[PDB]
Amino acid sequence: YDKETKTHATLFGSVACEHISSTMSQYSRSTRSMLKPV
Amino acid sequence: CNGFQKCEQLLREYGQFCSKINQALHGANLRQDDSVRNLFASVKSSQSSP
């Protein structure tokens, strides 16, 4: 959440750094139509 | 349910209970982190001969 800065980051647990891709379309998240390498 | 809209609609009715369960687990995990820090802090703050 980082409330004081108000900036936010998304973390994938125990997933290879290379696997996840920006604007990922291979996996579909039912809960959110839109979600917002290191 | 795994990606089922109807179970998600049922979840919306029971959403408040589901949110409470997450908050309790999140609070317990934070308390476990606090216990780890204090125990290590007692070990630390002592000068050590190599």
Side-chain angles (χ1 to χ4, degrees):
Chain A
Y1 184 54
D2 182 39
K3 171 180 48 185
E4 73 273 3
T5 328
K6 282 185 178 303
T7 66
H8 43 274
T10 304
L11 182 130
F12 294 84
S14 77
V15 189
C17 324
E18 42 97 6
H19 278 136
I20 301 297
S21 61
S22 303
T23 72
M24 200 154 54
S25 302
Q26 48 255 28
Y27 314 122
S28 58
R29 217 164 163 182
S30 57
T31 141
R32 36 188 49 86
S33 176
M34 300 301 174
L35 40 127
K36 184 60 187 60
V38 162
Chain B
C1 264
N2 296 356
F4 298 124
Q5 305 299 319
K6 290 203 58 180
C7 296
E8 263 71 280
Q9 169 257 355
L10 295 165
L11 168 123
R12 288 174 56 178
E13 315 158 1
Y14 323 126
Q16 66 284 333
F17 192 75
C18 303
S19 73
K20 284 191 291 291
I21 303 174
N22 319 327
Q23 299 167 4
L25 274 186
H26 171 75
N29 296 350
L30 288 186
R31 284 183 285 267
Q32 298 168 50
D33 292 343
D34 298 344
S35 76
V36 166
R37 292 182 186 96
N38 64 57
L39 173 65
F40 283 108
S42 78
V43 176
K44 205 48 208 61
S45 92
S46 55
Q47 26 183 15
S48 162
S49 187

mmCIF file with all atom_site columns, all heavy atoms in Angstrom, chain A residues 11-32:
data_model
loop_
_atom_site.group_PDB
_atom_site.id
_atom_site.type_symbol
_atom_site.label_atom_id
_atom_site.label_alt_id
_atom_site.label_comp_id
_atom_site.label_asym_id
_atom_site.label_entity_id
_atom_site.label_seq_id
_atom_site.pdbx_PDB_ins_code
_atom_site.Cartn_x
_atom_site.Cartn_y
_atom_site.Cartn_z
_atom_site.occupancy
_atom_site.B_iso_or_equiv
_atom_site.pdbx_formal_charge
_atom_site.auth_seq_id
_atom_site.auth_comp_id
_atom_site.auth_asym_id
_atom_site.auth_atom_id
_atom_site.pdbx_PDB_model_num
ATOM 1   N N   . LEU A 1 11 ? 3.469   -7.742  -6.220  1.00 0.00 ? 11 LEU A N   1
ATOM 2   C CA  . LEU A 1 11 ? 4.491   -8.797  -5.986  1.00 0.00 ? 11 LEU A CA  1
ATOM 3   C C   . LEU A 1 11 ? 3.901   -10.177 -6.291  1.00 0.00 ? 11 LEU A C   1
ATOM 4   O O   . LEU A 1 11 ? 2.786   -10.454 -5.826  1.00 0.00 ? 11 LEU A O   1
ATOM 5   C CB  . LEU A 1 11 ? 4.967   -8.712  -4.532  1.00 0.00 ? 11 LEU A CB  1
ATOM 6   C CG  . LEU A 1 11 ? 6.053   -9.710  -4.129  1.00 0.00 ? 11 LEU A CG  1
ATOM 7   C CD1 . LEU A 1 11 ? 7.210   -9.002  -3.445  1.00 0.00 ? 11 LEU A CD1 1
ATOM 8   C CD2 . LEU A 1 11 ? 5.490   -10.799 -3.229  1.00 0.00 ? 11 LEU A CD2 1
ATOM 9   N N   . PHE A 1 12 ? 4.627   -11.006 -7.046  1.00 0.00 ? 12 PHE A N   1
ATOM 10  C CA  . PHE A 1 12 ? 4.173   -12.396 -7.309  1.00 0.00 ? 12 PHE A CA  1
ATOM 11  C C   . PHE A 1 12 ? 4.993   -13.312 -6.397  1.00 0.00 ? 12 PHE A C   1
ATOM 12  O O   . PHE A 1 12 ? 6.232   -13.221 -6.438  1.00 0.00 ? 12 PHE A O   1
ATOM 13  C CB  . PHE A 1 12 ? 4.333   -12.732 -8.793  1.00 0.00 ? 12 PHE A CB  1
ATOM 14  C CG  . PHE A 1 12 ? 3.445   -11.927 -9.710  1.00 0.00 ? 12 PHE A CG  1
ATOM 15  C CD1 . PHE A 1 12 ? 3.820   -10.664 -10.138 1.00 0.00 ? 12 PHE A CD1 1
ATOM 16  C CD2 . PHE A 1 12 ? 2.228   -12.432 -10.138 1.00 0.00 ? 12 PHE A CD2 1
ATOM 17  C CE1 . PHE A 1 12 ? 2.999   -9.924  -10.973 1.00 0.00 ? 12 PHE A CE1 1
ATOM 18  C CE2 . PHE A 1 12 ? 1.410   -11.694 -10.978 1.00 0.00 ? 12 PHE A CE2 1
ATOM 19  C CZ  . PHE A 1 12 ? 1.797   -10.441 -11.394 1.00 0.00 ? 12 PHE A CZ  1
ATOM 20  N N   . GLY A 1 13 ? 4.333   -14.156 -5.599  1.00 0.00 ? 13 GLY A N   1
ATOM 21  C CA  . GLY A 1 13 ? 5.076   -14.959 -4.607  1.00 0.00 ? 13 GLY A CA  1
ATOM 22  C C   . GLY A 1 13 ? 5.744   -16.193 -5.185  1.00 0.00 ? 13 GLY A C   1
ATOM 23  O O   . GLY A 1 13 ? 5.036   -16.994 -5.820  1.00 0.00 ? 13 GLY A O   1
ATOM 24  N N   . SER A 1 14 ? 7.057   -16.341 -4.976  1.00 0.00 ? 14 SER A N   1
ATOM 25  C CA  . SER A 1 14 ? 7.804   -17.553 -5.414  1.00 0.00 ? 14 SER A CA  1
ATOM 26  C C   . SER A 1 14 ? 7.613   -17.835 -6.908  1.00 0.00 ? 14 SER A C   1
ATOM 27  O O   . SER A 1 14 ? 7.565   -19.019 -7.278  1.00 0.00 ? 14 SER A O   1
ATOM 28  C CB  . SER A 1 14 ? 7.477   -18.756 -4.559  1.00 0.00 ? 14 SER A CB  1
ATOM 29  O OG  . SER A 1 14 ? 6.217   -19.308 -4.906  1.00 0.00 ? 14 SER A OG  1
ATOM 30  N N   . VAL A 1 15 ? 7.571   -16.790 -7.740  1.00 0.00 ? 15 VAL A N   1
ATOM 31  C CA  . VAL A 1 15 ? 7.442   -16.983 -9.214  1.00 0.00 ? 15 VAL A CA  1
ATOM 32  C C   . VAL A 1 15 ? 8.764   -16.561 -9.861  1.00 0.00 ? 15 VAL A C   1
ATOM 33  O O   . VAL A 1 15 ? 9.345   -15.559 -9.403  1.00 0.00 ? 15 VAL A O   1
ATOM 34  C CB  . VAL A 1 15 ? 6.251   -16.205 -9.807  1.00 0.00 ? 15 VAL A CB  1
ATOM 35  C CG1 . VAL A 1 15 ? 6.014   -16.583 -11.261 1.00 0.00 ? 15 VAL A CG1 1
ATOM 36  C CG2 . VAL A 1 15 ? 4.979   -16.410 -9.002  1.00 0.00 ? 15 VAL A CG2 1
ATOM 37  N N   . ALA A 1 16 ? 9.219   -17.295 -10.880 1.00 0.00 ? 16 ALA A N   1
ATOM 38  C CA  . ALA A 1 16 ? 10.528  -16.987 -11.499 1.00 0.00 ? 16 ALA A CA  1
ATOM 39  C C   . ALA A 1 16 ? 10.489  -15.563 -12.058 1.00 0.00 ? 16 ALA A C   1
ATOM 40  O O   . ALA A 1 16 ? 9.446   -15.179 -12.628 1.00 0.00 ? 16 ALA A O   1
ATOM 41  C CB  . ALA A 1 16 ? 10.847  -17.997 -12.571 1.00 0.00 ? 16 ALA A CB  1
ATOM 42  N N   . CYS A 1 17 ? 11.591  -14.820 -11.917 1.00 0.00 ? 17 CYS A N   1
ATOM 43  C CA  . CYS A 1 17 ? 11.607  -13.396 -12.347 1.00 0.00 ? 17 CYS A CA  1
ATOM 44  C C   . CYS A 1 17 ? 11.326  -13.319 -13.853 1.00 0.00 ? 17 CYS A C   1
ATOM 45  O O   . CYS A 1 17 ? 10.565  -12.422 -14.264 1.00 0.00 ? 17 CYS A O   1
ATOM 46  C CB  . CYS A 1 17 ? 12.958  -12.766 -12.021 1.00 0.00 ? 17 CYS A CB  1
ATOM 47  S SG  . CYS A 1 17 ? 13.686  -13.364 -10.469 1.00 0.00 ? 17 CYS A SG  1
ATOM 48  N N   . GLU A 1 18 ? 11.909  -14.229 -14.638 1.00 0.00 ? 18 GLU A N   1
ATOM 49  C CA  . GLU A 1 18 ? 11.722  -14.242 -16.116 1.00 0.00 ? 18 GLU A CA  1
ATOM 50  C C   . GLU A 1 18 ? 10.277  -14.563 -16.525 1.00 0.00 ? 18 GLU A C   1
ATOM 51  O O   . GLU A 1 18 ? 9.809   -13.948 -17.504 1.00 0.00 ? 18 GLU A O   1
ATOM 52  C CB  . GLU A 1 18 ? 12.721  -15.204 -16.765 1.00 0.00 ? 18 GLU A CB  1
ATOM 53  C CG  . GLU A 1 18 ? 12.892  -16.511 -16.008 1.00 0.00 ? 18 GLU A CG  1
ATOM 54  C CD  . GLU A 1 18 ? 12.061  -17.674 -16.522 1.00 0.00 ? 18 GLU A CD  1
ATOM 55  O OE1 . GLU A 1 18 ? 11.402  -17.515 -17.570 1.00 0.00 ? 18 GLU A OE1 1
ATOM 56  O OE2 . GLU A 1 18 ? 12.080  -18.741 -15.879 1.00 0.00 ? 18 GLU A OE2 1
ATOM 57  N N   . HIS A 1 19 ? 9.595   -15.464 -15.809 1.00 0.00 ? 19 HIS A N   1
ATOM 58  C CA  . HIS A 1 19 ? 8.235   -15.920 -16.222 1.00 0.00 ? 19 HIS A CA  1
ATOM 59  C C   . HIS A 1 19 ? 7.223   -14.772 -16.330 1.00 0.00 ? 19 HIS A C   1
ATOM 60  O O   . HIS A 1 19 ? 6.632   -14.626 -17.419 1.00 0.00 ? 19 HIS A O   1
ATOM 61  C CB  . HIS A 1 19 ? 7.731   -17.043 -15.304 1.00 0.00 ? 19 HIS A CB  1
ATOM 62  C CG  . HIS A 1 19 ? 8.256   -18.390 -15.671 1.00 0.00 ? 19 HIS A CG  1
ATOM 63  N ND1 . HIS A 1 19 ? 8.726   -19.283 -14.730 1.00 0.00 ? 19 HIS A ND1 1
ATOM 64  C CD2 . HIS A 1 19 ? 8.392   -18.995 -16.871 1.00 0.00 ? 19 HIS A CD2 1
ATOM 65  C CE1 . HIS A 1 19 ? 9.131   -20.383 -15.333 1.00 0.00 ? 19 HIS A CE1 1
ATOM 66  N NE2 . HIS A 1 19 ? 8.935   -20.232 -16.648 1.00 0.00 ? 19 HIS A NE2 1
ATOM 67  N N   . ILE A 1 20 ? 7.013   -14.005 -15.258 1.00 0.00 ? 20 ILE A N   1
ATOM 68  C CA  . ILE A 1 20 ? 5.947   -12.954 -15.282 1.00 0.00 ? 20 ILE A CA  1
ATOM 69  C C   . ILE A 1 20 ? 6.276   -11.904 -16.348 1.00 0.00 ? 20 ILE A C   1
ATOM 70  O O   . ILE A 1 20 ? 7.462   -11.538 -16.471 1.00 0.00 ? 20 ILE A O   1
ATOM 71  C CB  . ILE A 1 20 ? 5.751   -12.332 -13.885 1.00 0.00 ? 20 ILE A CB  1
ATOM 72  C CG1 . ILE A 1 20 ? 5.352   -13.386 -12.851 1.00 0.00 ? 20 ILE A CG1 1
ATOM 73  C CG2 . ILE A 1 20 ? 4.741   -11.195 -13.930 1.00 0.00 ? 20 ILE A CG2 1
ATOM 74  C CD1 . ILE A 1 20 ? 4.031   -14.059 -13.145 1.00 0.00 ? 20 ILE A CD1 1
ATOM 75  N N   . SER A 1 21 ? 5.258   -11.436 -17.078 1.00 0.00 ? 21 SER A N   1
ATOM 76  C CA  . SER A 1 21 ? 5.464   -10.424 -18.147 1.00 0.00 ? 21 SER A CA  1
ATOM 77  C C   . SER A 1 21 ? 4.538   -9.227  -17.903 1.00 0.00 ? 21 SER A C   1
ATOM 78  O O   . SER A 1 21 ? 3.452   -9.431  -17.330 1.00 0.00 ? 21 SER A O   1
ATOM 79  C CB  . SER A 1 21 ? 5.220   -11.028 -19.504 1.00 0.00 ? 21 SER A CB  1
ATOM 80  O OG  . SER A 1 21 ? 3.887   -11.503 -19.611 1.00 0.00 ? 21 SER A OG  1
ATOM 81  N N   . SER A 1 22 ? 4.961   -8.027  -18.314 1.00 0.00 ? 22 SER A N   1
ATOM 82  C CA  . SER A 1 22 ? 4.125   -6.808  -18.149 1.00 0.00 ? 22 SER A CA  1
ATOM 83  C C   . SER A 1 22 ? 2.857   -6.942  -18.998 1.00 0.00 ? 22 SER A C   1
ATOM 84  O O   . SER A 1 22 ? 2.948   -7.560  -20.079 1.00 0.00 ? 22 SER A O   1
ATOM 85  C CB  . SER A 1 22 ? 4.902   -5.571  -18.514 1.00 0.00 ? 22 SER A CB  1
ATOM 86  O OG  . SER A 1 22 ? 6.080   -5.466  -17.727 1.00 0.00 ? 22 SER A OG  1
ATOM 87  N N   . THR A 1 23 ? 1.726   -6.403  -18.523 1.00 0.00 ? 23 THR A N   1
ATOM 88  C CA  . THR A 1 23 ? 0.430   -6.541  -19.249 1.00 0.00 ? 23 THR A CA  1
ATOM 89  C C   . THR A 1 23 ? 0.182   -8.029  -19.519 1.00 0.00 ? 23 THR A C   1
ATOM 90  O O   . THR A 1 23 ? -0.170  -8.368  -20.667 1.00 0.00 ? 23 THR A O   1
ATOM 91  C CB  . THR A 1 23 ? 0.341   -5.624  -20.479 1.00 0.00 ? 23 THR A CB  1
ATOM 92  O OG1 . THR A 1 23 ? 1.194   -6.098  -21.522 1.00 0.00 ? 23 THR A OG1 1
ATOM 93  C CG2 . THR A 1 23 ? 0.671   -4.181  -20.161 1.00 0.00 ? 23 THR A CG2 1
ATOM 94  N N   . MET A 1 24 ? 0.356   -8.874  -18.499 1.00 0.00 ? 24 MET A N   1
ATOM 95  C CA  . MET A 1 24 ? 0.236   -10.344 -18.691 1.00 0.00 ? 24 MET A CA  1
ATOM 96  C C   . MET A 1 24 ? -1.164  -10.681 -19.212 1.00 0.00 ? 24 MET A C   1
ATOM 97  O O   . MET A 1 24 ? -2.150  -10.216 -18.605 1.00 0.00 ? 24 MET A O   1
ATOM 98  C CB  . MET A 1 24 ? 0.443   -11.034 -17.341 1.00 0.00 ? 24 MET A CB  1
ATOM 99  C CG  . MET A 1 24 ? 0.808   -12.495 -17.440 1.00 0.00 ? 24 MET A CG  1
ATOM 100 S SD  . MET A 1 24 ? 1.731   -13.026 -15.980 1.00 0.00 ? 24 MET A SD  1
ATOM 101 C CE  . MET A 1 24 ? 0.606   -12.516 -14.682 1.00 0.00 ? 24 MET A CE  1
ATOM 102 N N   . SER A 1 25 ? -1.239  -11.471 -20.288 1.00 0.00 ? 25 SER A N   1
ATOM 103 C CA  . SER A 1 25 ? -2.551  -11.879 -20.856 1.00 0.00 ? 25 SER A CA  1
ATOM 104 C C   . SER A 1 25 ? -2.701  -13.402 -20.799 1.00 0.00 ? 25 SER A C   1
ATOM 105 O O   . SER A 1 25 ? -3.830  -13.885 -20.986 1.00 0.00 ? 25 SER A O   1
ATOM 106 C CB  . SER A 1 25 ? -2.710  -11.363 -22.262 1.00 0.00 ? 25 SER A CB  1
ATOM 107 O OG  . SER A 1 25 ? -2.601  -9.947  -22.295 1.00 0.00 ? 25 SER A OG  1
ATOM 108 N N   . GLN A 1 26 ? -1.604  -14.124 -20.549 1.00 0.00 ? 26 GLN A N   1
ATOM 109 C CA  . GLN A 1 26 ? -1.651  -15.612 -20.519 1.00 0.00 ? 26 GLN A CA  1
ATOM 110 C C   . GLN A 1 26 ? -2.565  -16.068 -19.377 1.00 0.00 ? 26 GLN A C   1
ATOM 111 O O   . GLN A 1 26 ? -3.296  -17.058 -19.570 1.00 0.00 ? 26 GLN A O   1
ATOM 112 C CB  . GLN A 1 26 ? -0.247  -16.222 -20.459 1.00 0.00 ? 26 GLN A CB  1
ATOM 113 C CG  . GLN A 1 26 ? 0.671   -15.597 -19.418 1.00 0.00 ? 26 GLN A CG  1
ATOM 114 C CD  . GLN A 1 26 ? 1.712   -14.695 -20.034 1.00 0.00 ? 26 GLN A CD  1
ATOM 115 O OE1 . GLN A 1 26 ? 1.506   -14.110 -21.096 1.00 0.00 ? 26 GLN A OE1 1
ATOM 116 N NE2 . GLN A 1 26 ? 2.843   -14.565 -19.360 1.00 0.00 ? 26 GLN A NE2 1
ATOM 117 N N   . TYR A 1 27 ? -2.518  -15.375 -18.236 1.00 0.00 ? 27 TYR A N   1
ATOM 118 C CA  . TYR A 1 27 ? -3.388  -15.718 -17.081 1.00 0.00 ? 27 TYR A CA  1
ATOM 119 C C   . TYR A 1 27 ? -4.474  -14.646 -16.954 1.00 0.00 ? 27 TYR A C   1
ATOM 120 O O   . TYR A 1 27 ? -4.152  -13.454 -17.125 1.00 0.00 ? 27 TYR A O   1
ATOM 121 C CB  . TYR A 1 27 ? -2.561  -15.829 -15.798 1.00 0.00 ? 27 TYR A CB  1
ATOM 122 C CG  . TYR A 1 27 ? -1.289  -16.629 -15.927 1.00 0.00 ? 27 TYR A CG  1
ATOM 123 C CD1 . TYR A 1 27 ? -0.060  -16.069 -15.623 1.00 0.00 ? 27 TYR A CD1 1
ATOM 124 C CD2 . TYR A 1 27 ? -1.311  -17.951 -16.340 1.00 0.00 ? 27 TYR A CD2 1
ATOM 125 C CE1 . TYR A 1 27 ? 1.114   -16.794 -15.733 1.00 0.00 ? 27 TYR A CE1 1
ATOM 126 C CE2 . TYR A 1 27 ? -0.146  -18.691 -16.457 1.00 0.00 ? 27 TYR A CE2 1
ATOM 127 C CZ  . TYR A 1 27 ? 1.072   -18.111 -16.151 1.00 0.00 ? 27 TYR A CZ  1
ATOM 128 O OH  . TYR A 1 27 ? 2.224   -18.833 -16.262 1.00 0.00 ? 27 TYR A OH  1
ATOM 129 N N   . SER A 1 28 ? -5.719  -15.056 -16.698 1.00 0.00 ? 28 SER A N   1
ATOM 130 C CA  . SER A 1 28 ? -6.844  -14.088 -16.607 1.00 0.00 ? 28 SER A CA  1
ATOM 131 C C   . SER A 1 28 ? -7.315  -13.963 -15.154 1.00 0.00 ? 28 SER A C   1
ATOM 132 O O   . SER A 1 28 ? -7.609  -14.998 -14.536 1.00 0.00 ? 28 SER A O   1
ATOM 133 C CB  . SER A 1 28 ? -7.979  -14.500 -17.504 1.00 0.00 ? 28 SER A CB  1
ATOM 134 O OG  . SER A 1 28 ? -8.438  -15.802 -17.173 1.00 0.00 ? 28 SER A OG  1
ATOM 135 N N   . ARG A 1 29 ? -7.402  -12.731 -14.642 1.00 0.00 ? 29 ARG A N   1
ATOM 136 C CA  . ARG A 1 29 ? -7.878  -12.515 -13.251 1.00 0.00 ? 29 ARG A CA  1
ATOM 137 C C   . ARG A 1 29 ? -9.362  -12.144 -13.300 1.00 0.00 ? 29 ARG A C   1
ATOM 138 O O   . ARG A 1 29 ? -9.682  -11.059 -13.822 1.00 0.00 ? 29 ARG A O   1
ATOM 139 C CB  . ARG A 1 29 ? -7.057  -11.406 -12.589 1.00 0.00 ? 29 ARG A CB  1
ATOM 140 C CG  . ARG A 1 29 ? -6.758  -11.631 -11.115 1.00 0.00 ? 29 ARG A CG  1
ATOM 141 C CD  . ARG A 1 29 ? -5.645  -10.694 -10.692 1.00 0.00 ? 29 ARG A CD  1
ATOM 142 N NE  . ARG A 1 29 ? -5.511  -10.507 -9.256  1.00 0.00 ? 29 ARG A NE  1
ATOM 143 C CZ  . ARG A 1 29 ? -4.618  -9.700  -8.696  1.00 0.00 ? 29 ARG A CZ  1
ATOM 144 N NH1 . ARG A 1 29 ? -3.781  -9.013  -9.454  1.00 0.00 ? 29 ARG A NH1 1
ATOM 145 N NH2 . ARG A 1 29 ? -4.565  -9.581  -7.382  1.00 0.00 ? 29 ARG A NH2 1
ATOM 146 N N   . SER A 1 30 ? -10.227 -13.016 -12.777 1.00 0.00 ? 30 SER A N   1
ATOM 147 C CA  . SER A 1 30 ? -11.692 -12.764 -12.788 1.00 0.00 ? 30 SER A CA  1
ATOM 148 C C   . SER A 1 30 ? -12.031 -11.543 -11.930 1.00 0.00 ? 30 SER A C   1
ATOM 149 O O   . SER A 1 30 ? -12.913 -10.764 -12.339 1.00 0.00 ? 30 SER A O   1
ATOM 150 C CB  . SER A 1 30 ? -12.450 -13.985 -12.332 1.00 0.00 ? 30 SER A CB  1
ATOM 151 O OG  . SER A 1 30 ? -12.020 -14.391 -11.040 1.00 0.00 ? 30 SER A OG  1
ATOM 152 N N   . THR A 1 31 ? -11.356 -11.383 -10.789 1.00 0.00 ? 31 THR A N   1
ATOM 153 C CA  . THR A 1 31 ? -11.695 -10.285 -9.844  1.00 0.00 ? 31 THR A CA  1
ATOM 154 C C   . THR A 1 31 ? -11.494 -8.903  -10.475 1.00 0.00 ? 31 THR A C   1
ATOM 155 O O   . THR A 1 31 ? -12.378 -8.047  -10.278 1.00 0.00 ? 31 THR A O   1
ATOM 156 C CB  . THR A 1 31 ? -10.828 -10.389 -8.585  1.00 0.00 ? 31 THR A CB  1
ATOM 157 O OG1 . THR A 1 31 ? -10.463 -9.062  -8.210  1.00 0.00 ? 31 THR A OG1 1
ATOM 158 C CG2 . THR A 1 31 ? -9.574  -11.203 -8.817  1.00 0.00 ? 31 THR A CG2 1
ATOM 159 N N   . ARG A 1 32 ? -10.392 -8.685  -11.198 1.00 0.00 ? 32 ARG A N   1
ATOM 160 C CA  . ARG A 1 32 ? -10.125 -7.317  -11.720 1.00 0.00 ? 32 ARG A CA  1
ATOM 161 C C   . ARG A 1 32 ? -9.902  -7.329  -13.233 1.00 0.00 ? 32 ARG A C   1
ATOM 162 O O   . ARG A 1 32 ? -9.020  -8.081  -13.692 1.00 0.00 ? 32 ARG A O   1
ATOM 163 C CB  . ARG A 1 32 ? -8.920  -6.708  -10.998 1.00 0.00 ? 32 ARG A CB  1
ATOM 164 C CG  . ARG A 1 32 ? -7.832  -7.716  -10.664 1.00 0.00 ? 32 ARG A CG  1
ATOM 165 C CD  . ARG A 1 32 ? -6.754  -7.104  -9.794  1.00 0.00 ? 32 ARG A CD  1
ATOM 166 N NE  . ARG A 1 32 ? -7.305  -6.396  -8.652  1.00 0.00 ? 32 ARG A NE  1
ATOM 167 C CZ  . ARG A 1 32 ? -7.614  -6.959  -7.492  1.00 0.00 ? 32 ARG A CZ  1
ATOM 168 N NH1 . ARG A 1 32 ? -7.439  -8.256  -7.307  1.00 0.00 ? 32 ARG A NH1 1
ATOM 169 N NH2 . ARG A 1 32 ? -8.105  -6.217  -6.519  1.00 0.00 ? 32 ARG A NH2 1
#
